[PDB]
Write an enzyme that holds these catalytic residues in place. Structure first.
Site, PDB file in Angstrom:
ATOM      1  N   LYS A 102       0.825  -1.216   0.000  1.00 49.01           N
ATOM      2  CA  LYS A 102       0.000   0.000   0.000  1.00 49.01           C
ATOM      3  C   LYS A 102       0.850   1.253   0.000  1.00 49.01           C
ATOM      4  O   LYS A 102       0.737   2.077  -0.892  1.00 49.01           O
ATOM      5  CB  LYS A 102      -0.935   0.035   1.198  1.00 49.01           C
ATOM      6  CG  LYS A 102      -1.986  -1.035   1.189  1.00 49.01           C
ATOM      7  CD  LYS A 102      -2.974  -0.783   2.301  1.00 49.01           C
ATOM      8  CE  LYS A 102      -2.361  -1.003   3.676  1.00 49.01           C
ATOM      9  NZ  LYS A 102      -2.211  -2.446   3.936  1.00 49.01           N
TER      10      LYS A 102
ATOM     11  N   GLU B  16       1.121   5.618  11.085  1.00 47.67           N
ATOM     12  CA  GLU B  16       2.022   4.760  10.346  1.00 47.67           C
ATOM     13  C   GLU B  16       3.387   4.771  10.979  1.00 47.67           C
ATOM     14  O   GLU B  16       3.529   4.963  12.189  1.00 47.67           O
ATOM     15  CB  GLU B  16       2.088   5.136   8.870  1.00 47.67           C
ATOM     16  CG  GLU B  16       1.151   4.315   7.988  1.00 47.67           C
ATOM     17  CD  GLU B  16       1.241   2.786   8.209  1.00 47.67           C
ATOM     18  OE1 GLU B  16       2.237   2.154   7.752  1.00 47.67           O
ATOM     19  OE2 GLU B  16       0.283   2.225   8.809  1.00 47.67           O
ATOM     20  N   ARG B  17       4.409   4.547  10.184  1.00 48.56           N
ATOM     21  CA  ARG B  17       5.717   4.409  10.758  1.00 48.56           C
ATOM     22  C   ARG B  17       6.459   5.731  10.728  1.00 48.56           C
ATOM     23  O   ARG B  17       6.730   6.273   9.655  1.00 48.56           O
ATOM     24  CB  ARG B  17       6.475   3.311  10.023  1.00 48.56           C
ATOM     25  CG  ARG B  17       5.648   2.076   9.867  1.00 48.56           C
ATOM     26  CD  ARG B  17       6.360   1.150   8.974  1.00 48.56           C
ATOM     27  NE  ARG B  17       5.982  -0.208   9.286  1.00 48.56           N
ATOM     28  CZ  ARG B  17       4.951  -0.823   8.743  1.00 48.56           C
ATOM     29  NH1 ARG B  17       4.206  -0.181   7.856  1.00 48.56           N
ATOM     30  NH2 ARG B  17       4.671  -2.072   9.086  1.00 48.56           N
TER      31      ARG B  17
HETATM   32  N1  ANP Z   1       6.088  -2.368  -6.501  1.00 48.58           N
HETATM   33  C1  ANP Z   1       6.734  -3.191  -5.643  1.00 48.58           C
HETATM   34  N2  ANP Z   1       7.813  -3.892  -6.065  1.00 48.58           N
HETATM   35  C2  ANP Z   1       8.516  -4.727  -5.273  1.00 48.58           C
HETATM   36  N3  ANP Z   1       8.216  -4.958  -3.985  1.00 48.58           N
HETATM   37  C3  ANP Z   1       7.069  -4.265  -3.433  1.00 48.58           C
HETATM   38  C4  ANP Z   1       6.276  -3.340  -4.230  1.00 48.58           C
HETATM   39  N4  ANP Z   1       5.318  -2.884  -3.391  1.00 48.58           N
HETATM   40  C5  ANP Z   1       5.519  -3.492  -2.168  1.00 48.58           C
HETATM   41  N5  ANP Z   1       6.581  -4.338  -2.199  1.00 48.58           N
HETATM   42  C6  ANP Z   1       7.140  -5.150  -1.099  1.00 48.58           C
HETATM   43  O1  ANP Z   1       6.243  -5.309  -0.004  1.00 48.58           O
HETATM   44  C7  ANP Z   1       6.764  -4.676   1.159  1.00 48.58           C
HETATM   45  C8  ANP Z   1       5.734  -3.903   1.913  1.00 48.58           C
HETATM   46  O2  ANP Z   1       5.499  -2.747   1.174  1.00 48.58           O
HETATM   47  P1  ANP Z   1       4.527  -1.758   1.917  1.00 48.58           P
HETATM   48  O3  ANP Z   1       4.014  -0.689   0.860  1.00 48.58           O
HETATM   49  O4  ANP Z   1       5.223  -1.163   3.218  1.00 48.58           O
HETATM   50  O5  ANP Z   1       3.354  -2.741   2.334  1.00 48.58           O
HETATM   51  P2  ANP Z   1       2.167  -2.108   3.157  1.00 48.58           P
HETATM   52  O6  ANP Z   1       0.842  -2.912   2.821  1.00 48.58           O
HETATM   53  O7  ANP Z   1       1.977  -0.544   2.938  1.00 48.58           O
HETATM   54  N6  ANP Z   1       2.574  -2.289   4.809  1.00 48.58           N
HETATM   55  P3  ANP Z   1       1.394  -1.566   5.863  1.00 48.58           P
HETATM   56  O8  ANP Z   1       1.369   0.038   5.658  1.00 48.58           O
HETATM   57  O9  ANP Z   1       1.739  -2.074   7.350  1.00 48.58           O
HETATM   58  O10 ANP Z   1      -0.021  -2.180   5.452  1.00 48.58           O
HETATM   59  C9  ANP Z   1       8.010  -3.906   0.771  1.00 48.58           C
HETATM   60  O11 ANP Z   1       9.057  -3.962   1.729  1.00 48.58           O
HETATM   61  C10 ANP Z   1       8.324  -4.353  -0.636  1.00 48.58           C
HETATM   62  O12 ANP Z   1       9.267  -5.411  -0.586  1.00 48.58           O
HETATM   63 MG    MG Z   2       2.741   0.750   4.645  1.00 46.98          MG
END
Ligand code: ANP
Ligand code: MG
Ligand code: ANP
Ligand code: ANP
Ligand code: MG
Lengths: 500, 470, 53, 469
Positions: free
Chosen positions: B158, B184-185
Site C-alpha cells: 500500500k 504509520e511508521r
Molecule cells: N512495486 C513493488 N515492487 C517490489 N516490492 C514491493 C512493491 N510494493 C511493495 N513491495 C514489497 O512489499 C513490502 C511492503 O510494502 P509496503 O508498501 O510497506 O506494504 P504495506 O501494505 O503498505 N505495509 P502496511 O502500511 O503495514 O499495510 C516492501 O518492503 C516491498 O518489498
Molecule cells: Mg505501509
C-alpha cells in the site's frame, strides 16, 4: 581486607534523619485501592508501609488504583501508603553489560550493584520524523536463510513469529552469538550490543540461556532483563519498556544495540491482567482496548538516528507466539502490521528437516537489500523469487505427471538450494563463508551432487577455500563486494573443487 | 482575558475527567489545555457526564497528571493554521509545527471539526486522472475529483503504491497537496520529507507544493484519532478558499477507526461486533463526507485502507468501500507471485469504467482482459487435477493469453527500485489500452511469458523478447 | 486391449475418488457447523462481558 | 488472645468475614469455624475494605449461618514436612486421612512460599532413561527436569504416569511425593493399594513415597490448593534434607480449573474462554516452585489435562512454557489402538540434542520424524486417491512410516489388563539401533503387523516368524 564488616557498618550509620500519603481501602489480586495521595502523578511509583512498591494507574475521584510490584499478603487495609514523587525509571549505561536485572533494573545475577551513567524513564517518546535516517547497515545474523532471504538492518524492527516450540528463540539467540565477530574488536561503530528481554519465561529457562551465552563468551556484550513467570503482572508488562530504555542509551550515544522481546504475547497477557483487575472494561479476547498502542509505542522506539544525532541505531527483534498457525488472531495481527517485516517459523517445515524452519513464502524484510552486504546481495540475485517458483513447480509435481527438462531443472536446483540453507543451531557463519556457498548453489555448481551429500559439501568446501584461496575469502570480508575479477577467481575456485 | 478554569478529577489511561463551576461547561468537541513542565497538554471534550463534569480525550500521554490540576478552556475545537503558510511545513495533530523551522505564520486558524457539505453543494463529474500505472488506468481508472481507496492487508504494498502515486500525480499537478500520516511508521514519514525535498515538491528556501500532517503510531489514540481531521482541514481550506485543486493523501485511514476503537470502552460504550465501537458507521461517515469535490473547488484523495487479517469483510474496511469512487484491491495471492503492484484485476473497480467515460474500445478491452483472467481462474481446478493436457484448444489459448496478461499488469515502480533494482517505468494510458488490445487479438502469441513481466509498454515486451532470445 | 483396460481402471479409480471426497465433504460439513456455531458464541461472549462492566 | 470474626456472607465456596477491630487477618491466612463435625478452614483471599475480608473455604459451606464466629489462626495453611510424612496420606490442610493417627513431625510449614530465586537456579543436561521407546528416542526426559503429559480424556495420562512410577520410582532410592489433584478417589484408593503391595509404602517398615489427595469430589478451594501442600512437602525434601525427589502431580489442570470455578464469585471480570484474569501468574507462582535448585534436584512428572481436546485452550497453552519435556497424547492415535498414544510429531524435549544424545541418536530421530512428517503430508491424497497414485519413493516412505508408527507402540506392564500381552521395557541404546535398522530398510520385507505392540527389534523378528506360521 582488615575487617571488611567494619567498613559497611560505618557507612550505613547515619542515613535516617529527614523522614518526618494515602490509607489503603481494600486490597486484593495485585491491586490496592487507596484513599488519599492527592498530589500523585498518573503512573507514579508508591512505597507501601510494608515495603512493597506499586504504581498508580487509576486516579479516580474518590480514590487511587494501584498495581503492586510484589505479593500482597503484606498489604492490609488501612496501612499507610507513600508518594515517591517519581515515574517508573531505570539505570542505564554500559555498566549494564553482562548483567541480569529485573524489570526495575536490580541485579538478580548476584554480581552486586549496577553502575549507571544515568536513568531513563520506562516510557519515552520515540524519536520523531525529524532526527532519523535510512537503514543501510546490516545486522548480520550468520543465518544463511535469513542473511540471503530476509536481511535485517541496523535500525529496523523485525518480527519473529510462529507457533510454540518452532525455534523462535533460537533465531534470536543465533543472531546474538554472531556479534562476537565484531564485539571483540575495537571499532565501536561496527559493534552490536544485545538486550534480551525475558517476559513470562520460567527462571531456569533464563538460566539455561545465560549459561549458553557464557558458553559462547557472548555475555560480555549482552544485558538480559528478566520478568519471569512468577513476577508481578506489572513487572512483566513493564520490562520491555524499561529494556527499551537500557538499549536506547546505546542508540543515543553513537552505538548500536539489539533488542529481543521474548515475547510480546505474554506482555499482553499480563497487560490484560492489570486492566481486568483494575476493572477497565475489556476489548477483544478480554484484552484492553489499546493493547495495540501498547506495542506500537514500544516498537517505534527502535530507529536509526541521523548523523546530527550520532548515527546510533536500536534494532528490534520482537517475538510472538501463535496458536495452530493462526496469524489472524488479535495480537499477532497487531504486531505484524507494526513491524518492518516478519520471519515465519513453521512446525511442518521443522519436522521435515528445514531448520531454521523459516517460511520463505511468508517471511519478509521490508528494508530489503538496503541492509544486505553487497557481496551477498550480488550472488543472492533473485534467490527468494526463485525459491517461490520452486514451491510452485513442486506443487505441480504432486500431479505426478511426467516432467520436462525445464521443470526437472528448477526442481533439482530448488531442492539443493533448500538443502543449502539448512543450518545447525549455535553455528552462525561469516559472510565470506556464506557467499561462496550461495554462489555455488545459485550458479548451479551443486546441481550434480547427491542430496544427502550436500551436507558434506558445505564444510569440505569451506575447508578447502580457507586452505587454498584464503586471499579471496579475506577480500570478500574486507571489501564486502565481489569485483568482476573476484567473481572470476571464485568461479574458477568453485568449478575446480566440484570436480572433487 | 475572560478565562474559564476547571480541575482534573480523574485520569484513566487516555481519558481525563474535568470539573467546572456552575453551568459553564465547554461544549463537546472543545479543546482544553493544561500547561505542563514540557509544553502543554491538549484535551478534547467528549461527553458531559453531568454534575458539572466532562469526559475528555487527551491529545497526548496522560502520565504525570495530577488530580485537581487547573484546566483551561480554549473556547473552541482544536485549531490548525491554514492556507499557503502550511506549505513545506510538518504539522502535528494540534496544528503545531514539528519541523523546527519556527512558527507557522498564517493569518487564519481553523477548527478541525467542521460540517460536511450539504447535498446541494455536491459536484458530479466523470473526469479521468491518468496515473501512469497500467492496471489502474486499464481496469479501474482513478477519477479526478474522485475518492480512491487502496485496500490491502499488511505489507502487500500500500504505502509503496501510494508513494508511486505521489511520485507521478503530484508533479503534474498544478495546485497544492496535503499528505496525512495517520498512525504509520515514523520512519516512512521521515523518508517522505526527505523525498519531497529531493523531488523538489518541497523547498525550505523557496516555493513548496505540499503540506505535511503527521500523527504516527508512536502516538496515543486521541491524537491518532483526530490528526486526520487536522490534515483534512488544511485541504478543505485550499478547496474552498483558494478555490482550487487539491490532492489529499491519507495513509492510513484505517487507524482513524482503530483509534476510535481504543478509547470507546473508556468512554463507557458497549462494544459492537468484532469489538468495534458502536459509532463506526457514522464516525467514518462524518469524516469521509467532508473529503469531497464541491462547487467551490475540487479535492482528489488517495486513502490507503488497512485490511485487518487480510479479511475484507472486517467491519472496518467493509464500511469504507461505500465511500470511494474507485477501489484498488491489493492481494497477497497476487503479490506472492512476484506480481507488483499486488492489484487484484477482478476485485478492483472504478465507477469511470463505463463506455460513456472512456469510450467503447477501452471498455471492451477492459472487459475482455477481465473475462480472460476470470476463465483462467475458473480453469485452475482442471489444470491442477488433469494437468494442462486435458483442455479444449480455445481454452489452451485463453490460458496462454491469460498468463501473458497477468504479467503485463505488473510494472516496475520508481519508488520500489530498492526492491527490483529495475528502473521505474511509467506507461501512458493510450499505450496501455493499445498493447492489451494487441495482446488480446493474438498479435503476440509467439512471445514467451517472461517478456511481459516487470516491463513498461509493448515496446518493452519486444525489447525484452529479443534481448532474452539473444 | 491395454487402452481399454486402462480406461476401465481410470473409470473405477475416479469412481472411488468421488466416494471418498463424498465422505470427506460430510465430515468437514459437520466440522463447519461446529466452528460456525462457536464463532457465534465466543463472539457473543466478548460483547456480554464488555456490556456487564 | 484469640482474634474472632463474624460470618457476614456466604456465596458458594466464598465466605465473607467481618472483624470487630483494627487487626485484620493477613491475606493468605487460615481461618477456622468450629462445626459440629470438626472444623471448617478458610483462606483469606482479599480485604474488601471496612474490616471485612473475603475468604475461600477449604471445604463445603453447607449450613453456615450469617453472624457465625470465625477464629483467626494467624498463619497460612500448615502442613507436616520431613521424614514423618512418608507413607502417610494427607489433606489439603496437611492432616492425616489414612486413619492412622497424628503425623508427629517437628515442623509445620506454610503452603504458600515464594519460588526459588534466579541466583538459586541450577541447570544440567542429564538424560533419564525411561524404557519407553517414543520418549527414550524422540523426546528424552531429563533428570531433575520438569516433565508433563498432555492429553484429553481417556487418552491415558494416568496409565502412562503409572508406567513411569513403575520404572523410575522402584530403582530410584530417594523420596517420592505423589499428589492427586482433581482425579478419581478410586484411582487414589488404588494407588494406596498398589504401594503397600510393591512395598514402596510399608505400614510396618520404612517408606519411600508420600500421599497428598485433593480429589475431584472436593470443593474448588480444596482443589485450588492441595497441590501447594504436595509441593511444600517436596520442597522440604529438596532444600532441607538435600534429596533427589520424584514428584508426580495428577492432574495439574484441575488446579487452574478450580481457580476459575471461584473467580467470578471473587468479583473478577472474566478473561478469554471464561478464565480468571490471573491464570498465567497464578500458575507461575506454583509452577516456578516445582524446580531443581542449587540445594536439591527435583524430577517431576505432571499430568496435564486438555479441555475439549483443544490444545490451544488457555490452560494448557500456558503450561507448556513451564516444562522441559512435553509429551502429548492424541485421541486419534489411541483410536488407532496405538499405546502409548503419543504424538511422535508434537512431543518435545530440550535433551534431544547431539551434545546430549549424540549424533546417531540425534539423526535416527530426525530421519524418523521426516518419515512420519511425510506420511502426514500425504494423508490427504491417500484419503481420496489412495496409495496407487503415490510415486515410488513416496510409496515406500508410507509403508515405512506405517511400520515406524506401529513400532513406536509398546506394551506396558501396568496396562496389561488392556492389551493382555505382558508389558515390555526397551532400553535407550536398544531403541536407537532398532529404529536405525528399520530406517535402513533392513526389515522392509516384514508384515506391518509385526511392528505392532512388541518390545525391541528382536520381538519383531519373533512375531513375524510366529505369524509366518
Ligand atoms: N512495486 C513493488 N515492487 C517490489 N516490492 C514491493 C512493491 N510494493 C511493495 N513491495 C514489497 O512489499 C513490502 C511492503 O510494502 P509496503 O508498501 O510497506 O506494504 P504495506 O501494505 O503498505 N505495509 P502496511 O502500511 O503495514 O499495510 C516492501 O518492503 C516491498 O518489498
Ligand atoms: Mg505501509
Ligand atoms: N537450527 C536448529 N537445529 C536443530 N534444532 C533447533 C534449531 N533451532 C531450534 N532448534 C531446537 O528446537 C527446540 C525449540 O526451539 P526454540 O528455539 O525454543 O523455539 P521456540 O519457538 O523459542 N520454543 P518456545 O519459545 O519454548 O515455545 C530447541 O530444543 C532447539 O534445540
Ligand atoms: N499405554 C496404554 N496401554 C493400554 N491402554 C491405555 C494406555 N493408555 C491409556 N489406555 C487406555 O485408555 C484409558 C484411559 O487411560 P487413562 O490412564 O485413565 O487416561 P487418562 O487420559 O489419564 N483419562 P482421565 O484421567 O479420565 O482424563 C484406559 O482405560 C486404558 O485402557
Ligand atoms: Mg522460546
Amino acid at each position: 581486607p582488615t575487617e571488611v564488616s567494619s567498613i559497611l557498618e560505618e557507612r550505613i550509620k547515619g542515613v535516617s534523619d529527614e523522614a518526618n500519603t494515602g490509607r489503603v481501602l481494600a486490597v486484593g489480586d495485585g491491586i490496592a485501592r487507596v484513599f488519599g495521595l492527592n498530589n500523585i502523578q498518573a503512573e507514579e511509583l508508591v512505597e507501601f508501609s510494608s515495603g512493597v512498591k506499586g504504581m498508580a494507574l487509576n486516579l479516580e475521584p474518590g480514590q487511587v488504583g494501584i498495581v503492586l510490584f510484589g505479593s500482597d499478603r503484606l498489604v492490609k487495609e488501612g496501612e499507610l501508603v507513600k508518594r515517591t514523587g517519581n515515574i517508573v525509571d531505570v539505570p542505564v549505561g554500559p555498566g549494564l553489560l553482562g548483567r541480569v536485572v529485573d524489570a526495575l533494573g536490580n541485579p538478580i545475577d548476584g554480581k552486586g550493584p549496577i553502575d549507571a551513567a544515568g536513568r531513563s524513564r520506562a516510557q519515552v517518546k520515540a524519536p520523531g520524523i525529524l532526527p532519523r535516517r535510512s537503514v543501510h547497515e546490516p545486522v548480520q545474523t550468520g543465518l544463511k536463510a535469513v542473511d540471503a532471504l530476509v536481511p535485517i538492518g541496523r535500525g529496523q524492527r523485525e518480527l519473529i513469529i510462529g507457533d510454540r516450540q518452532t525455534g523462535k528463540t533460537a533465531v534470536a539467540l543465533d543472531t546474538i552469538l554472531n556479534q562476537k565477530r565484531w564485539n571483540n574488536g575495537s571499532d565501536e561503530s561496527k559493534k552490536l550490543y544485545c538486550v534480551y528481554v525475558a517476559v513470562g519465561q520460567k527462571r531456569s529457562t533464563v538460566a539455561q540461556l545465560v549459561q549458553t551465552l557464557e558458553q559462547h563468551d557472548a555475555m560480555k556484550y549482552s544485558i538480559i532483563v528478566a520478568a519471569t513467570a512468577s513476577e508481578a503482572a506489572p513487572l512483566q508488562y513493564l520490562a520491555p519498556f524499561t529494556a527499551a530504555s537500557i538499549g536506547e542509551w546505546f542508540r543515543d550515544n553513537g552505538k548500536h544495540a539489539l533488542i529481543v522481546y521474548d515475547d510480546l504475547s505474554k506482555q499482553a497477557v499480563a497487560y490484560r491482567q492489570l486492566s481486568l483487575l483494575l476493572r477497565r472494561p475489556p476489548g477483544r479476547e478480554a484484552y484492553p482496548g489499546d493493547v495495540f498502542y501498547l506495542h506500537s509505542r514500544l516498537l517505534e522506539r527502535a530507529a536509526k538516528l541521523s548523523e546530527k544525532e550520532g548515527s546510533g541505531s536500536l534494532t528490534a527483534l520482537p517475538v510472538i507466539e501463535t496458536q495452530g498457525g493462526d496469524v489472524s488472531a488479535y495480537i499477532p495481527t497487531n504486531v505484524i502490521s507494526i513491524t518492518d517485516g516478519q520471519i515465519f517459523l513453521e512446525a511442518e517445515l521443522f519436522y521435515k528437516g528445514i531448520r531454521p524452519a523459516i517460511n520463505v513464502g511468508l517471511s519478509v524484510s521490508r528494508v530489503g537489500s538496503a541492509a544486505q552486504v553487497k557481496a551477498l546481495k550480488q550472488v543472492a540475485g533473485s534467490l527468494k523469487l526463485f525459491l517461490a517458483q520452486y514451491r510452485e513447480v513442486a506443487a505441480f509435481a504432486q500431479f505426478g505427471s511426467d516432467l520436462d527438462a525445464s521443470t526437472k531443472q528448477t526442481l533439482v536446483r530448488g531442492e539443493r538450494l533448500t538443502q543449502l540453507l539448512k543450518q545447525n543451531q549455535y553455528s552462525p557463519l561469516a559472510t565470506e563463508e556464506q557467499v561462496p556457498l550461495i554462489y555455488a548453489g545459485v550458479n548451479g555448481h551443486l546441481d550434480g551432487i547427491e542430496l544427502s551429500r550436500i551436507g558434506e559439501f558445505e564444510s569440505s568446501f569451506l575447508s578447502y577455500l580457507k586452505s587454498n584461496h584464503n586471499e579471496l575469502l579475506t577480500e570478500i570480508r574486507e571489501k564486502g563486494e565481489l569485483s568482476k575479477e573476484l567473481l572470476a577467481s571464485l568461479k574458477s575456485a568453485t568449478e575446480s573443487f566440484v570436480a572433487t | 482575558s475572560t478565562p474559564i478554569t476547571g480541575k482534573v478529577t480523574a485520569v484513566i489511561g487516555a481519558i481525563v475527567d474535568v470539573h467546572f463551576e456552575q453551568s459553564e461547561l465547554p461544549a463537546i468537541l472543545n479543546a482544553l489545555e493544561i500547561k505542563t513542565p514540557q509544553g502543554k497538554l491538549v484535551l478534547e471534550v467528549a461527553q458531559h457526564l453531568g454534575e458539572n463534569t466532562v469526559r475528555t480525550i487527551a491529545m497526548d500521554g496522560t502520565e504525570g497528571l495530577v488530580r485537581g490540576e487547573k484546566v483551561l478552556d480554549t473556547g473552541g475545537p482544536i485549531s490548525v493554521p491554514v492556507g499557503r503558510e502550511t506549505l513545506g511545513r510538518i504539522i502535528n495533530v494540534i496544528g503545531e509545527p514539528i519541523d523546527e523551522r519556527g512558527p507557522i505564520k498564517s493569518k487564519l486558524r481553523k477548527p478541525i471539526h467542521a460540517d460536511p457539505p450539504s447535498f446541494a453543494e455536491q459536484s458530479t463529474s466523470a473526469e479521468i486522472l491518468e496515473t501512469g500505472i497500467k492496471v489502474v488506468d486499464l481496469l479501474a481508472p482513478y477519477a479526478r475529483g474522485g475518492k480512491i481507496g487502496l485496500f490491502g492487508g499488511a505489507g502487500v504494498g500500500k504505502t509503496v503504491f501510494i508513494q508511486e502515486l505521489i511520485n507521478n500525480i503530484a508533479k503534474a499537478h498544478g495546485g497544492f497537496s496535503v499528505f496525512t500520516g495517520v498512525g504509520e511508521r515514523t520512519r516512512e514519514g521521515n523518508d517522505l520529507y526527505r523525498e519531497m525535498k529531493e523531488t523538489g515538491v518541497i523547498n525550505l528556501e523557496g516555493e513548496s507544493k505540499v503540506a505535511l500532517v503527521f500523527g504516527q503510531m508512536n502516538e496515543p489514540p486521541g491524537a491518532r484519532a483526530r490528526v486526520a481531521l487536522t490534515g483534512l482541514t488544511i485541504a478543505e481550506y485550499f478547496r474552498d478558499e483558494e478555490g482550487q485543486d487539491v490532492l489529499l493523501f491519507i495513509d492510513n485511514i484505517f487507524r482513524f477507526t482503530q483509534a476510535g476503537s481504543e478509547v470507546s470502552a473508556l468512554l463507557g460504550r458497549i462494544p459492537s461486533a468484532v469489538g468495534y465501537q458502536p459509532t463506526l458507521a457514522t464516525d467514518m461517515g462524518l469524516l469521509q463526507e467532508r473529503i469531497t469535490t464541491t462547487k467551490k473547488g475540487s479535492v482528489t484523495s488517495v486513502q490507503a485502507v488497512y485490511v485487518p487479517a487480510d479479511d475484507l469483510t472486517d467491519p472496518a474496511p467493509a464500511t469504507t468501500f461505500a465511500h470511494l469512487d474507485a477501489t484498488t484491491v491489493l492481494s497477497r495471492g497476487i503479490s506472492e507471485l512476484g506480481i507488483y503492484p499486488a492489484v487484484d484485476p477482478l476485485d478492483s473497480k472504478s465507477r469511470l469504467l463505463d463506455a460513456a467515460v472512456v469510450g467503447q474500445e477501452h471498455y471492451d478491452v477492459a472487459s475482455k482482459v477481465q473475462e480472460t483472467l476470470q476463465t483462467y481462474k475458473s480453469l485452475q481446478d482442471i489444470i491442477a487435477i488433469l494437468g494442462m493436457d486435458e483442455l479444449s484448444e480455445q481454452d489452451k489459448l485463453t490460458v496462454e493469453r491469460a498468463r501473458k496478461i497477468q504479467r503485463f499488469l505488473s510494472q516496475p515502480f520508481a519508488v520500489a527500485e530498492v526492491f527490483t533494482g529495475i528502473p521505474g517505468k511509467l506507461v501512458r494510458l493510450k499505450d496501455t489500452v493499445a498493447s492489451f488490445k494487441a495482446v488480446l487479438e493474438g498479435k503476440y502469441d509467439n512471445i514467451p511469458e517472461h517478456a511481459f513481466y516487470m516491463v513498461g509498454g509493448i515496446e518493452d515486451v519486444v525489447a525484452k523478447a529479443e534481448k532474452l532470445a539473444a | 486391449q491395454g487402452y481399454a483396460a486402462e480406461i476401465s481402471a481410470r473409470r473405477n479409480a475416479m469412481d472411488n475418488a468421488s466416494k471418498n471426497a463424498g465422505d470427506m465433504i460430510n465430515r468437514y460439513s459437520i466440522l463447519y457447523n461446529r466452528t460456525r456455531q462457536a464463532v457465534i458464541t465466543n463472539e457473543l461472549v466478548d460483547i456480554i462481558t464488555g456490556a456487564s462492566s
